[model samples]
Target: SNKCDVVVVGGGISGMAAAKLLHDSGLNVVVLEARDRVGGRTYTLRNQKVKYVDLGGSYVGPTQNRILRLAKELGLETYKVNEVERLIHHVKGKSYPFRGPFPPVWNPITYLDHNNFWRTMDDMGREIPSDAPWKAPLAEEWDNMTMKELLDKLCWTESAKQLATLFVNLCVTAETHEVSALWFLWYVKQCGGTTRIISTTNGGQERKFVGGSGQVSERIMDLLGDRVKLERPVIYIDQTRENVLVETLNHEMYEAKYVISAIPPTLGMKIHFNPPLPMMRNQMITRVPLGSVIKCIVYYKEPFWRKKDYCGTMIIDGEEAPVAYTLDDTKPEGNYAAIMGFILAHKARKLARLTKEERLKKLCELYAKVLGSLEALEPVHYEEKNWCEEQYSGGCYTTYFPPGILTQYGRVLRQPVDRIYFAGTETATHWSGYMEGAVEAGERAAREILHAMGKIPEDEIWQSEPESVDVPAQPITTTFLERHLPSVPGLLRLI
Candidate 1:
């Protein structure tokens, strides 16, 4: 057993950030991580010949300046994502090449339906307030209806409906029907706007860390020294009127005046609360389930797709395989060539049942279909991570609410239960499923604790801007049909 002023459960970015801030403020803070290493959802894998690669959350963009500042402070470097010149869209086993965002060829009616869909999303996004979505006008009505229901109300073409559904799945790692319309709008608003959320040029997926996203957590751990204890999975939390006691799977215990649970809500449900949570909180936790995803990277001897003047980005409209989309992940210097793919939602759950060989074979076949060459089927290296199977993570990206859950119980989502505070990307008010959101939430939790302890003046309490940097100028101004939709930069790559 040990005693500290505060104990942070989970050594991911959120936990590490909170611990660092509190420890720097002279609090005896300790961080307990279930994994042997830091980084949480941000894992970096290194191959002898490949140098370094991230199998988890990676990439930072213009408005995500908090992470940029942290990286710069840590002496880490970043580079732009490989330029995308040509895009391949796979539909019903056929591949179509396009130079811009919109489909190269579509029924004129499909174009109108697509434009109307995005326009509606934009309007709804503006109507839903980010901080208090449940209080928005018609919040209950929107919350009660699933995104699928909202889409059906618009009466879009079948092709338009699939496109819209694909966009939502790529953004949140869940199907349209699985999440609330209000929840979906709030998510889009958190990323600024729909165009900003989906585009990479000045959006969330702008740049890549020179090393790996995990370096951010690793560096924080380096600064924290021995304050972090790895391989300690917290199984129970007992909060008294004055302090909190956190018990780990290893039988070790930590007592503190305050505790910051920086793990995902899904993971938080695993911990037994000594005095069980309120019914509303318990129900909210159970309703907020993780979105499933399988992230894979295929390495090749060269940027073969680039040699063919292709952008190395591809999207598959049909469920020919588990893969929804892929992007060029080649190194800046071209030392190694690779593409990253995301198999999302129900497809990912189904794929999880197959053997590793079977999964790889299917993915390779899909690659061949998109690249229009048998060479695409053969890769020097193929690696994948099924986040849903990871006991500690439960799933990738972040947990999402089903219809009506958010409006009904979101008030207590971040409310502290005595001395236990919540902090995670999912708890953030902005960019709730991105690294920037995780960092912001951690900082917010630390500030709240500091204020409670009277370490900072009441008015001096910390407040973060949605964007730490000046909002980048809008890249293009045109109707949805006329505008090119660039590949999403870091879509579903980080949480």
Candidate 2:
């Protein structure tokens, strides 16, 4: 309702972090939120006591350093995800134990096919620039093909392709037929590699916030005080005048010299814009949609699976199943045990509108069958957060390009239109769809305006961090032999 140096749309981590940085620099900044609370993708559930459960973005790992730095500054501590004994793979009603990323697909041909498929992905992914995957030489070819199309052409065996199909759903939170192959490879590379993205011990889900990630934004909210305005959904933004204009549903008006829009790209349709954001930018927002994902948590009284030296994790492989992945979400102190599972892709959409009672029952029965324990049938409490139902966000994880959008419209993703700038995880280059990307993008946007204000250097516009942790970086790519090794040696090929 007033003129300021900057107005950040959306109170998520990206918006909050952007405004927080500008404010710390002694510039006037205000955050406009469309939700009833802060933390857009970072939501947590608190019990009557102190412990909390994460219903939204919660994991952080090795390469994700920006969020780690912020968490340290905010006094938010993190705990390593419990990577205990063994993981169970449930396929076709048969449950068995496995220790590595790929489970026993019950076929002799799958292992070789699986290894080659991922190697080519990482190889192509590494070549594509995280900042602009569309600029790759073969991006046109890659973008034209859907993941399912690539899978069909690459894998020889039906069983191998089926196993890979399940993984694609787990990673993208969408069917293989839905995501662009180029975009998917770029996304996988953004985190680190194919292996790092899926692993638990030393990968994307290596650790969790001790107090839940939602508290990080809450702490930022405390720092910003009333500057972080909630329930004030920005309905329109017109940057035609001397001062950029922002309007709320309540008819409140706010003007700022610069506007940093941190809302989800899909929300672009809701907010009216002046000069129409050029053609590609307009097309970019309307086209990219959020992936379908529903997170379910079932609280058990005791850690029953631990008695059998089993980690409370499962790779559930059933088409009608409610969940594809499960992780041990028990408290670090062992006061109570909770299991976190995600019903993803088509399943999330199918079960999205249904009652939580039925979803919880399905999750419980699935867990009982996988873990071979009847105690999973009884739970003290259950919680579910279906991101697809969110009004402002419309979905979770992040928005993705399907087929041709990235090659055409991806350049305008984070490009500033006059005084209007974009900052969201979706606009991020590193760790996109994670909290780390949110922080990285927010700071990058804040720096963009600081450069416009002649207060910073041009290098600050893009975010950067080492791809590896140290000098001799832990390699994300595999060796040639690892990639081309056959079931039999070259002698068999020669034969």
Candidate 3:
């Protein structure tokens, strides 16, 4: 219904950032979001009686400077995560109290296996540069094999292998058999190192926004004001030699000189392209699928676990529960004590098929086992945000490449196809699945558009440089536990 110089589809962090940059440059930009909210994957749910909790992507780590800087620019505040005093490792019907990073059942065989796994991953990570992973020396070889295959090749003890596989699942939210070794290596490389990606003391889960991560996109939306249109699902895009036409599911249309798709690759495939995208691009879109995650929060009246000297951090290893990791999400002052869990990958998919009551019952049972108390089973409030059930966002976090897709079509990801440009965390060269990646990718896309339009100097155009680090041959050690225990299952790796 309205015309603009640029139209951004998806009002998530990426879309908002791109639209903001474009608007600041004097270009009239409109942001169309399929959902009624602006946060996209960074959604935060608030209850006046309780507190604000992030149901989607949250946390900012040490090296994620972009999101931190953006928070500062927006006058937002952040706080460190709750301290952990003790970590509980739940396997089978028994719970082991661990005081260190390595599981309580560590032996020399498992230790050596752990060391070898990290060493090999670190070595492979060094080989794959974030920007051009496809050009790595063994790109094709790595891409053809799955992470599980690589783990099998490592030939670790069964327990050690399970532990390593769980750690990988925590990183990508996919089963070991689901992700390609090349893609996994590229991901770790982008995060600086495997240890940095998973740790909390200096890693990605270190800090949390005071209000919630969703405030970031909300503040951006406030800046744009009427420029953002909610519940406008873009269903079709027609790009011509002159301009592009974008149509929403409601049949409303907008014309723009350029279009930026900030949606995930899977959701991007839903939109009908007039002439259709290039075969390579279409294949890339179809190939890069989202990883499933169900984020749940259970709130209690007080910090009961703290009274028992428990950190309220738990990692379940056996078939006792589908939850990968649980963390104490108590806010400042400890007014509301809560525990959050991530039901990831196949577990999340299977759980999504159950009724709300059934899911809650199972989660409560697991909570009782992990916490070793009936109190945990009875919380004042219990809530869950199943991202896979989301209408517009088919899943959470970001899209991931299977084997062969990255090397074959990764170049087309950010390449402007005629007047259409792609902007999302998945297109990011750094911190690809994190909020920092989203902002970085959005800003880069905006600069590219500006450069193409001759509105910005060529040198002033933003481009992400591939970061390099010396991956030591030594495996991540147990020193991580001295600072803080692993609060999340999928994110924990040794120091």
Best by lDDT: 2
Q: In terms of TM-score, how similar is model 3 to the real structure? A: 0.91
lDDT (C-alpha) at residue 380 in model 1: 83
List where candidate 1 sits over 4 angstroms from the true fold: 99-106, 458-462, 465-476, 479-495
**Higher lDDT: candidate 1 or 3?**
1
What does candidate 3's lDDT look like per residue over 226-291, in tens digits? Answer: 989888999999985467999998888999999889988778788999888988888787788788
Model 2: what TM-score? 0.95
Error of 2 at 312 (Å): 1.1
- On TM-score, the leading prediction is 2
Best-first order by lDDT: 2, 1, 3
Query: What is the C-alpha local distance difference test score of candidate 2?
Result: 0.83
List the lowest-lDDT window of 10 residues for candidate 1.
Answer: 486-495
lDDT of each: 0.81, 0.83, 0.80
- Where model 2 places Cα greater than 4 Å from the true spot, the runs are 104-107, 463-481, 487-495
Better of 2 and 3 by TM-score: 2
Ordered by TM-score, highest first, the candidates read: 2, 1, 3
How many clashing residue pairs are found in candidate 3?
Answer: 1
